[PDB]
């Protein structure tokens, strides 16, 4: 896990000290941000179905070769698995926005994802295309506020950089 509170408390514990002024200051940083990230998280939770479907459609349109036999999307079951993976990543992004840090993403969708995608012949470029489409598709303020958009695009960019 990884968040503002977890980071500052882990640092204090490693130094074996009570939470000092800096730790409280970091928690105030969490407080101020919340609104934006929590809003972004609320919109993602209420609109994930469509967002995940759009991301998967863009992923399979950019790389139609996935539908070829022996590729990651040769079967409708594997296409559904791809949309489910995009759903999982979007849910982890929502968890990161709620948490205020890349913790849920790092632990549940990033750590070991490289080995899994190598083993299952899943090109990281497909996930990258889906998340890039989701990031560029977001519009301000029809979808979220400017800072909620900043949080959403930051989480998406973190996933993209983890995959590239």
């Amino acid at each position: 896990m990884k968040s503002v509170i977890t980071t500052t408390i882990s640092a204090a514990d490693a130094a074996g000290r009570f939470p000092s002024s800096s730790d409280l200051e970091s928690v105030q940083g969490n407080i101020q941000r919340a609104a934006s990230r929590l809003e972004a998280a609320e919109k993602l939770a209420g609109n994930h179905e469509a967002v995940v479907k759009e991301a998967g459609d863009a992923c399979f349109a950019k790389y139609p070769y996935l539908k070829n036999p022996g590729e990651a999307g040769d079967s409708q079951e594997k296409i559904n698995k791809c949309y489910r993976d995009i759903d999982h990543y979007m849910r982890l992004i929502n968890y990161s926005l709620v948490v205020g840090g890349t913790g849920p993403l790092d632990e549940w969708g990033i750590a070991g994802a490289r080995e899994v995608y190598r083993a299952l012949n899943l090109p990281g470029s497909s996930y990258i295309a889906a998340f890039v489409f989701t990031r560029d598709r977001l519009c301000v303020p029809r979808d979220m506020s400017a800072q909620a958009a900043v949080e959403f695009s930051g989480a998406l960019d973190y996933v993209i950089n983890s995959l590239c």
Partner: protein, 176 residues
């Protein structure tokens, strides 16, 4: 470890569910009480030595056998170890209060603490008494009801945070 928000997302992850509106509202209430929690943590931390020393002294006064030969607080080495353990428990309780979740407390202090104290012969009843005195003093500091030290905060009701501190101390006492 986990904080309140990470606790919420862990609970949501148990069902592959996005963070629901109810959980989001609970975390928004957590954020709105941000200075409530931060002033509580500041009250505990700014009086941490007071809390720990008072709790250990009270546990010793109520159980004079602890400072008798064979007692676990006799030998200044053992007494300093007791004060250090009280400080560590209060530190992790402050961590839990700051995080809004007891995962840090349990995982990094309470995990194996019972077996460790049994192996070292640390009395569980005396440790529980010291932790309970720490609980009472810390709760008093949260509510700014400490007789000898008052911290200036905006008027309000921090009973939720006092109960949270009490719950963390009860977790400590039940772990041993």
């Amino acid at each position: 470890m986990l904080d309140a928000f990470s606790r919420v997302v862990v609970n949501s992850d148990s069902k592959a569910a996005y963070v629901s509106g109810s959980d989001l509202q609970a975390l928004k209430t957590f954020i709105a009480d941000g200075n409530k929690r931060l002033d509580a943590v500041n009250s505990i931390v700014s009086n941490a030595s007071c809390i720990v020393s008072d709790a250990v002294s009270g546990m010793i006064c109520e159980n004079p056998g602890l400072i008798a030969p064979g007692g676990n607080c006799y030998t200044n080495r053992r007494m300093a170890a007791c004060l250090r353990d009280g400080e560590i428990i209060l530190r992790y309780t402050s961590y839990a209060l700051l995080a809004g979740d007891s995962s840090v407390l349990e995982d990094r202090c309470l995990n194996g603490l019972k077996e460790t104290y049994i192996a070292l012969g640390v009395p569980t009843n005396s440790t529980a008494r010291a932790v309970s005195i720490m609980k009472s003093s810390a709760v008093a500091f949260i509510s700014n009801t400490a007789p000898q030290r008052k911290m200036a905060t905006a008027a309000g009701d921090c009973s939720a945070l006092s109960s949270e501190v009490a719950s963390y101390c009860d977790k400590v006492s039940a772990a041993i």
